[PDB]
Amino acid sequence: ATPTEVSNLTEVSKGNYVIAATVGTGNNETNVLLTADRLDDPNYKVTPTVQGTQNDGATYWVFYNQRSLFALNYNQTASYSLNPAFEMTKDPRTYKLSRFTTYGFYNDYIMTTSSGSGTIDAQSYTYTDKSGQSLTETYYPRHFLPAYIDARNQTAKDGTGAGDIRLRAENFLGNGEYVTLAGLEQVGNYLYSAAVPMGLSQWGYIQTVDGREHGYVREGYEDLVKTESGGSGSGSYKANELQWTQYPDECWVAIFKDETLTEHKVIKSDRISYACGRNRSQYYQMVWQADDGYLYVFSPSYAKTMSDARQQTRLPAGVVRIDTRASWEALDFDPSYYQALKNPDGSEAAFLRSWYTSGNYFLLLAYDAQGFKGTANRLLIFDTQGDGTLREVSGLPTDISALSNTPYIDDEGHAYVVVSTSTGYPTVYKIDPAAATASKGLTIVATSVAGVGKLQAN
Known part of the structure; x- marks a missing residue:
């Protein structure tokens, strides 16, 4: 122009x-x-x-x-x-916030959480490095580190997760691997999140399981353990640490009773991969409570971009759901719901973010024809009662080069997205997700x- x-x-x-x-x-x-x-x-x-x-x-x-x-x-x-x-x-x-991997709301609290090093149950481990020098290092378990901003009283707390054993991310799913929380969806009093498996940490790798030293390492998974501290930026690994998950064909949702992240439960679905969006270092939420009382859980199957095949998943990108209107003992995935998230041309859909408008419509931000290698700049619409085939919005420009980080949902379902x-x-642009239309504003x-x-x- x-x-x-x-x-x-x-x-x-x-x-x-x-x-x-x-x-x-x-x-x-x-x-x-x-x-x-x-x-x-x-x-x-x-x-x-x-x-x-x-x-x-x-x-x-x-x-x-x-x-x-x-x-x-x-x-x-x-x-x-x-x-x-x-x-x-x-x-x-002003407020001081440590670096967090995800954020969300809970009552009048803006919560920011990440999985980091704890303080209790330290373990000293001696090994031989890649140069031959005997090295002894102290490892700490991985704990959830929650921080809270009370926006009503205008205060900030850093929480106590590294000292509380109840907030230990290590062995959160029962296989030894530690998880990262993606999303913080408040449902009544519960906090629903996606427990993205991160693999074995340094503290988890030196764990002896029933006599088997490093027992949390699966059979034939010893060659995947990184022998030195390599990488750069957000993509870095230390020695005696198993990067990425060993079980990519699963999807784990963690339900916490309150914001303290103390008491919790976990539920597994073997229909999709883990539920998160990874651009570089932030875990974008994929769990969303809808109007029908169902928490929908999306997954783009990001584990298919792994180098080794043992860390790659065969489960395509799809969405499942959980009925949030039940007792704590009866919370589990809906066995009658499954969608295969596909592009309008029929191929699998690779996305990065996903918001919820209203009714039975979600707004997803998918990549182009290059998959995860390209740029995420396609605003598509998913119907909970559809067949998984994503619908394209009519009225949006083609030369999309920048989008707003968060759309605004009005008091009737329209989605206001700033397209650049x-x-x-x-x-x-005001997007009607029902008719899948866009109007310039x-x-x-x-x-x-x-x-x-x-x-x-x-």
Whole structure:
């Protein structure tokens, strides 16, 4: 497009809709917050030179109800409110958040969790390295490390998971491997999550099981153990550690009684793989409670990209479900529900994120024809009562180069997604998932938009 194209559009007025945009790419990157009273009218526009509040950016933009807008980062977590002038203001209280692998809501708490090193039950282990030098190292069990942001009282706690043995991720499924929690779906008082198996840790590898040293290593799985600390970034491994899971043909859902993550249960389904989206280091949620009282559990079968065949799964990408309206003793997968998530052309569907609108429709973000090797930039619609074949949205552009990290579901089911084409500015599109249609709306005169939501002034 051109910066003079929006000369015929009307400058929108300040309202209750909040947009987190970025003007500039790189060192000119300036994060601004804009307010508008409408998002579906394509005749309107919003300009950062007329309005907007400069902010320090965010790794994740979260909406605490229609009251606050939190900025989560791996550090400097901030929060913003809406003043009577319909402008974004910065709350005076900041929060320190350790690096987390997933996040979610629970009552008025923004919870951020990850599976890290514990403090109790340390074990010293001596071995021979790849150079021949005898080395002795102390290993700690893997524990869940929950952190909570009380958005109503505006406080932050780091929790006590490394000292509590009840929050030990090691041997969470009964096979010795430790798991990572993906998603934090609150259902009444329970927390449903996907226990993505991470494999054997250093502490779990040195575990003797019924006399068998390293008993948690399956037969013929000794050659997969990494002998030294290699890799880089989020993809790194230490010695005496078995990277990735040994059981890819399973799907484990963990149900916690409350936010303390103390008492819990686990349920297994052998129809799909683990339920998470992995881009680099964050586990995107795949478990979602729907209106029909069913928690749907999606799986793109990410384990098919593994090098060795023992860590590859033969289960295609699919979705199962769990009936959340039952007793704690009767919580299990629905044996009569299974879908084969497929692209409109019939092939298997590889996706990265998946949100829930309303009714019986989910919005998934799938890759192109390159699979997990390509770019995830296809917004498809899944029907819970369908045949697993994903439906494509009519009205979205083809040159999609950037999308909003989190869509806004209105009070009736429509999904507001900010699509950024390579030949124009980021524009809000209102998607009807029932008819699988998209309508052009507000045009943001910025480089890209991270999040869009609705807040009420205070």
